[PDB]
Amino acid sequence: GPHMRSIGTTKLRLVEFSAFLEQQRDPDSYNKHLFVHIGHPLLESVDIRQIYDKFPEKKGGLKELFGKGPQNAFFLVKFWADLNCNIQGAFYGVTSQYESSENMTVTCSTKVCSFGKQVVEKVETEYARFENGRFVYRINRSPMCEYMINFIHKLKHLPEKYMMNSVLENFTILLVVTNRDTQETLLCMACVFEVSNSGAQHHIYRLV
Numbered sequence: 001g002p003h004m005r006s007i008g009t010t011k012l013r014l015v016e017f018s019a020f021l022e023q024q025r026d027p028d029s030y031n032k033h034l035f036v037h038i039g040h041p042l043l044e045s046v047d048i049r050q051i052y053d054k055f056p057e058k059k060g061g062l063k064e065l066f067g068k069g070p071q072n073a074f075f076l077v078k079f080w081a082d083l084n085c086n087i088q089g090a091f092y093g094v095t096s097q098y099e100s101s102e103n104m105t106v107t108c109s110t111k112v113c114s115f116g117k118q119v120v121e122k123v124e125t126e127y128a129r130f131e132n133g134r135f136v137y138r139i140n141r142s143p144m145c146e147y148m149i150n151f152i153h154k155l156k157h158l159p160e161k162y163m164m165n166s167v168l169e170n171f172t173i174l175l176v177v178t179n180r181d182t183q184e185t186l187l188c189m190a191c192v193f194e195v196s197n198s199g200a201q202h203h204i205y206r207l208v
């Protein structure tokens with residue numbers, strides 16, 4: 001029973017995101033493979049109660065966060081990942097760009113969850129840069145955690161995409177972007193994953 005509606009006004013917008021493997025063939029030659037990406041306006045809704053068991057739910061958990069921060073800042077992102085790359089000076093990285101009309105100090109928290117339990121959290125703090133009339137927050141070449149590198153390797157070893165999808169049923173990512181000074185939730189993305197059989201795809205929903 002979803003509702004499909006505009007996003008409306010938000011203090012922070014996600015403009016770009018990619019997760020990638022860059023491999024250096026030699027000092028002047030590099031290959032880059034994208035696993036997932038966004039950015040390269042009606043949204044349907046998803047009942048957040050459907051996903052509580054896939055994320056931590058203690059103090060500071062998804063249910064507490066949703067109850068507090070503005071509800072229009074919460075999204076579910078379904079990714080279809082591209083695993084079709086020949087892994088061989090490899091750098092596993094993420095890039096993202098956010099934009100705002102306000103100058104803020106932003107903290108981005110990325111929690112990796114397995115069977116609904118947090119197994120890694122990455123925390124990055126970003127200051128604004130003024131760029132042609134607005135404030136831009138760019139994360140360039142943020143390294144993956146060891147857990148994701150190992151996880152990608154293990155998935156790639158499986159012989160069929162449906163076996164990777166079964167494994168991915170219990171893997172999720174929770175991104176929470178907060179105003180560091182005020183603790184306001186600026187954006188929250190609860191992320192679920194399958195493997196693409198198409199490159200990579202995604203669909204975004206509003207959490208309600």
Ligand SMILES: */C=C\C(=O)N1C[C@@H](n2cc(-c3cccnc3)nn2)[C@H](OCc2ccc(C(F)(F)F)cc2)C1
Pocket residue numbers: 017019035036081082083094096110112120121122143144145148151152155173175189191193194
């Ligand atoms: C320590 C964490 C880490 O290295 N990660 C977090 C994963 N992540 C980040 C985001 C995200 C979404 C929107 C905005 N900002 C960040 N979503 N997921 C990164 O890995 C992504 C990923 C790569 C490959 C696969 C796989 F295995 F299915 F192919 C899944 C997820 C890195």
